[PDB]
């Protein structure tokens, strides 16, 4: 147990990828295998740590440890896994391994690329496993350069504008986060202060709770797209290589929700309990606004980006409406979206690069040359339609149940908000099938020449199937992601004071 796992689990990828540099061997071949082996080793170590070294029955922290790092402003190597973290950690390992696999036929650089992939890997796990607030911030901003390089080196026509908007926007958003760090770091620094575990008992005065709450909420709304702060997403998604975009719109977005769950609802209750209803309202109007603007777009990559935007309203409404299941249904939702959005962007980037046409009007009948892409695309479109069976349904269902049985509401908005939320089910197929019909159905020209038109080979097909099967497995019996008993203590603080 004291043999450190999380330290290894964080310093393995970047270290074992630093050997790609100073290795003159080839152009592209050996690096792919040397990276996929490291990724598989890391994932196996992750699942070994989870299986026989975790309990699911105690809401404390597990596998924790700490050291002394800078010691002036108390900032340690404090690190520990917990219930909320575990799901996102496993999902990150899984989807990033599969993204690195999907990045197989890249020979442009193929040495900086896989190393940057491993760096983003290590950074994501570092954030998701953090236990010291300043270290959480460090892991947050560590990934900001690798993603910029992956954008500006590979992907899309207008890569530059997208990349620079994304980097400037995210770096600016993190400023309010650093403001909150400086705010609650100096608040009695003799009491540990920078130990995210020992902050549960902090009793801050009024008019300061609100400022720290907002300093974190602004940064989160920057990372996790909230309506007035979403303009950056369509550009940095419609221009990214599908290999990047898989992990980008499947993990990096969910950090904005994991942080909001971990440092807002757990640390600043009376700063969050007096601000939950507006969060709920914003999420409710987002669910419909994102879809109503998705239907308007004309290049299917941006349409997929907006569909990813829309489902981020269920997470919001689950963070508000303070219940056990409303918070708990949010986690299942971030998992069942990290699957679906990632797979949909992979399919969009794989259909494209075969047709070299981005505007959804000229896409002929692609069903005739390549059937398997059509099948695995319609399947995940159905998944994104919140169709039952697949995991896109039970998440939204539990979100509804959390809102309905919420205690901080009395039947007036508890129904109108449910109504405006259910309009999403009428609205989403209108823009998903409108793409499925223009780009796949109909009989285009006699596209008989089997050139620049080949169905998915073994690698892409296996990736699709191996991401698909978890969706069914979770949607049939969801309780494979309800191994969360921290909410029974996470929603314990809030539940009696005023109002």
């Amino acid at each position: 147990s004291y043999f450190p796992w999380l330290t290894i689990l964080v310093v393995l990828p970047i270290f074992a990828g630093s050997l790609i540099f100073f290795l003159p061997h080839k152009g592209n071949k050996i690096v792919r295998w040397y990276t996929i082996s490291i990724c598989l080793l890391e994932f196996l170590l992750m699942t070994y740590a989870f299986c026989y070294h975790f309990q699911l029955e105690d809401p404390l922290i597990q596998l924790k440890e700490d050291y002394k790092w800078i010691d002036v402003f108390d900032f340690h190597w404090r690190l520990g896994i917990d219930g909320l973290s575990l799901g996102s950690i496993l999902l990150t390992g899984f989807i990033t391994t599969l993204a690195t696999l999907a990045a197989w036929p890249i020979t442009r650089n193929s040495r900086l690329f896989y190393f940057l992939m491993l760096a983003m890997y290590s950074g994501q796990i570092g954030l998701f496993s953090s236990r010291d607030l300043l270290l959480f911030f460090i892991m947050w901003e560590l990934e900001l350069i690798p993603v910029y390089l992956l954008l500006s080196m590979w992907g899309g026509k207008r890569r530059l504008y997208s990349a620079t908007k994304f980097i400037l926007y995210t770096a600016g958003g993190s400023i309010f986060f650093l403001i909150g760090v400086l705010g609650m770091g100096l608040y009695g620094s003799n009491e540990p202060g920078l130990d995210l575990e020992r902050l549960i008992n902090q009793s801050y005065p009024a008019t300061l709770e609100i400022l720290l709450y907002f300093g974190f909420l602004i940064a989160y709304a920057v990372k996790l797209p909230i309506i007035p702060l979403h303009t950056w997403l369509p550009d940095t998604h419609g221009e990214a290589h599908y290999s990047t975009c898989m992990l980008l719109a499947g993990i990096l977005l969910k950090m904005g929700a994991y942080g909001l769950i971990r440092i807002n609802m757990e640390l600043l209750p009376h700063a969050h309990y007096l601000f939950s209803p507006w969060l709920v309202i914003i999420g409710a109007i987002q669910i419909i606004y994102a879809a109503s603007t998705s239907l308007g777009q004309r290049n299917f990559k941006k349409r997929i980006a907006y569909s990813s935007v829309s489902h981020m309203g269920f997470i919001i409404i689950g963070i508000g409406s303070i219940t056990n299941i409303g918070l708990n249904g949010a986690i299942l939702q971030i998992l069942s979206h990290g699957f679906i959005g990632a797979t949909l962007f992979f399919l969009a980037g794989t259909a494209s690069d075969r047709m070299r046409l981005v505007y959804l009007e000229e896409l002929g009948g692609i069903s005739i040359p390549m059937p398997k892409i059509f099948t695995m695309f319609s399947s995940f479109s159905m998944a994104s339609l919140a169709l039952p069976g697949m995991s896109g349904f039970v998440a939204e269902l539990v979100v509804f149940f959390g809102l309905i049985t919420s205690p901080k509401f009395l039947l007036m908005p508890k129904a109108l908000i449910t109504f405006v939320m259910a309009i999403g089910m009428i609205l989403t197929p209108i823009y998903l099938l409108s793409m499925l019909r223009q780009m796949f159905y109909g009989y285009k020209l006699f596209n008989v020449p089997n050139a620049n038109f080949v169905d998915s080979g073994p690698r892409e097909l296996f990736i699709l199937i191996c991401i698909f099967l978890p969706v069914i497995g979770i949607g049939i019996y969801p309780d494979f992601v309800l191994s969360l008993s921290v909410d029974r203590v996470e929603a314990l603080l809030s539940n009696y004071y005023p109002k």
Partner: protein
């Protein structure tokens, strides 16, 4: 059990029970540790990413290489010099 509800319009009675995977939620994740078998379906041949009808390997390379036009204008200048 087998409670027997005498409802006011029909002839019901029911029987229910509670079940849940005890801890095999570990064993199913261990079995889904079959992603370590993602190596036989990767060493297989690539469909066309290695085909002769492909050169350029970025995410916009083959699509937006598309500046042999500049080289062609330069070749025009050279032919005019000839």
């Amino acid at each position: 059990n087998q409670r027997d509800w005498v409802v006011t319009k029909s002839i019901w009675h029911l029987s229910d029970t509670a079940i849940k995977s005890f801890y095999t939620f570990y064993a199913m994740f261990t079995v889904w540790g079959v992603c370590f078998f993602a190596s036989m379906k990767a060493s297989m041949a690539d469909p066309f990413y290695d085909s002769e009808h492909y050169r350029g390997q970025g995410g916009d390379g083959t699509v937006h290489w598309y500046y042999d036009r500049q080289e062609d204008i330069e070749a025009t200048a050279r032919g005019d010099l000839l």
